Every structure is written in structure tokens, then in C-alpha cells.
């Protein structure tokens, strides 16, 4: 690769609720699974996240 | 490092997903000029999604709100801003996982059905018995009293193994 990218926190990390993660994934998968696509093994990563979203949709309250 | 994960509520589980805004200086490709947004995501996408990262010490579940606009009055580089969501389990955390592959000496779990969790024999109850079956192999670990291992297991993180491929959690049922 050779050119690293610099990352700066603009905010301190925030813990998100189980209901936020659940809405984030819906929106993130749907966006990234949308045509006008990019497979590049993201196809399998998404498959994984779908597995994660299901787990959460089952978590209590 | 640690924004400590709060163990809470009625689940006794320690929430590990954190939202993290970050601004980055990316090496845009020539191919993506006039459309850097789609470019930066080939710096973000597969690159990071579902793959552990050290600067934010956690799995990057996905990003939200990519704003390349971090530049606005040729051109190799560019500033952009995004919010990452990160699975950030840390030592000591109390997680929960489904039973994947069990075998005498080392039970295996899948947290949220997608992250590799395993507890060594050492860390197993010791009053838990491992019986072999119609496999020879259908071995399946039943506890003292005698119900075959539940399905979803409680356990405390003892170590998070970051290393090339899938991150792996090393837990203990103390």
C-alpha cells in the first residue's frame, strides 16, 4: 500500500444503544448492498453483519 | 486501549459497540477524481469493514456519514470526515456467545453469531463432563448435573487476539 492514512478523533467515542446499532446496520447494509455496487469481498463482510443484525434483533428489550 | 465498556442493565453483558467520529487524510486515487466520495470508500469499505483496526482498537462494523466535503475553496490527496461504529471488546468484559464447535479441550463460541470466541479446557467448570458419541465425532460437553451445554454461553473476556485474519476472543467460564 505504502501511503498510510492519518486518522484523527473529532469526538470522544460514544457507546450506542442496542436500538441504535440495530438501526445503523439496517441502513448500512441496505446502502452497501444496493446496486451501483462494490463487491470486493464486502459481499461476505455484509453477509456477516447480517448475521450480527439478526442476533441483535433477538436480544432482549 | 479503553473507553471502558459499561456492563449494564438486565443483560449483565458489557456493551462493546461504540460510535467514533474521525477525520482522515486519504490518498485519493487518480481514477476517482471528480468523484472522491466513491474513492474514499475504497479506503473505507472492504478495507476496514469487519476487519479489526488498531488506531481505533476494534472491529469496524461500518461507517456512517462519509463527508468528503472536508475540502472546498491535479490533487492527489484529500480530507474527509466519517463516523465509524466499532466492536471494541476489552479484557475483563462480560460477553455472550452461541456454541459453535465444541471439543474435549477448548469450547468454541460465536459472539453475535460472527466473532470467534473460545474458552480453553483450563477455563471450563471442571465439574463439566465431556462425552463422545455416534461420531467417533459427536462429542458434546454436558455439565455436572447433566444438560448438554445450553446453546448460548456467558463468559468473561480474558484476552482479545488481534492478528491478520478474524480477530479472536479468548474467554473463561471461571
UniProtKB/Swiss-Prot annotation, chain A:
Record-given protein name: DNA-directed RNA polymerase I subunit RPA14
Span covered, complete protein: 16 to 101 of 137
Subcellular location(s) of the protein: Nucleus, Nucleolus
PTM statement from Swiss-Prot or TrEMBL: The N-terminus is blocked.
Subunit note: Component of the RNA polymerase I (Pol I) complex consisting of 14 subunits: RPA135, RPA190, RPC40, RPA14, RPB5, RPO26, RPA43, RPB8, RPA12, RPB10, RPC19, RPC10, RPA49 and RPA34. The complex is composed of a horseshoe-shaped core containing ten subunits (RPA135, RPA190, RPB5, RPO26, RPB8, RPB10, RPC10, RPA12, RPC19 and RPC40) where RPA135 and RPA190 form the DNA-binding cleft. Outside of the core, RPA14 and RPA43 form the stalk that mediates interactions with transcription initiation factors and newly synthesized RNA.
Signal peptide: none
Protein origin, superkingdom: Eukaryota
Additional detail: Present with 3100 molecules/cell in log phase SD medium.
Protein task: DNA-dependent RNA polymerases catalyze the transcription of DNA into RNA using the four ribonucleoside triphosphates as substrates. Component of RNA polymerase I (Pol I) which synthesizes ribosomal RNA precursors. RPA14 seems to play a role in the stability of subunits RPO26 and RPA43. In vitro, the RPA14-RPA43 subcomplex binds single-stranded RNA.
UniProtKB/Swiss-Prot annotation, chain B:
Function statement: DNA-dependent RNA polymerases catalyze the transcription of DNA into RNA using the four ribonucleoside triphosphates as substrates. Component of RNA polymerase I (Pol I) which synthesizes ribosomal RNA precursors. Besides, RNA polymerase I has intrinsic RNA cleavage activity. Through its association with RRN3 is involved in recruitment of Pol I to rDNA promoters. In vitro, the A13-A43 subcomplex binds single-stranded RNA.
Post-translational modification: Contains an average of four phosphates per molecule.
Protein name from the UniProt record: DNA-directed RNA polymerase I subunit RPA43
Subunit and partners: Component of the RNA polymerase I (Pol I) complex consisting of 14 subunits: RPA135, RPA190, RPC40, RPA14, RPB5, RPO26, RPA43, RPB8, RPA12, RPB10, RPC19, RPC10, RPA49 and RPA34. The complex is composed of a horseshoe-shaped core containing ten subunits (RPA135, RPA190, RPB5, RPO26, RPB8, RPB10, RPC10, RPA12, RPC19 and RPC40) where RPA135 and RPA190 form the DNA-binding cleft. Outside of the core, RPA14 and RPA43 form the stalk that mediates interactions with transcription initiation factors and newly synthesized RNA. Interacts with RPO26/ABC23 and with the initiation factor RRN3.
Coiled coil: none
Modified residues (Phosphoserine): 168
Broad class of the protein's primary localization: nucleus
Protein family membership: Belongs to the eukaryotic RPA43 RNA polymerase subunit family.
One record GO biological process: ribosome biogenesis
Source organism phylogeny: Eukaryota, Fungi, Dikarya, Ascomycota, Saccharomycotina
Originating species: Saccharomyces cerevisiae (strain ATCC 204508 / S288c) (Baker's yeast)
Protein location: Nucleus, Nucleolus
Extra information: Present with 4070 molecules/cell in log phase SD medium.
Keywords: DNA-directed RNA polymerase, Nucleus, Phosphoprotein, Ribosome biogenesis, Transcription
GO cellular component: nucleus; RNA polymerase I complex
Gene Ontology molecular function terms on file: DNA-directed RNA polymerase activity
Domain of life: Eukaryota
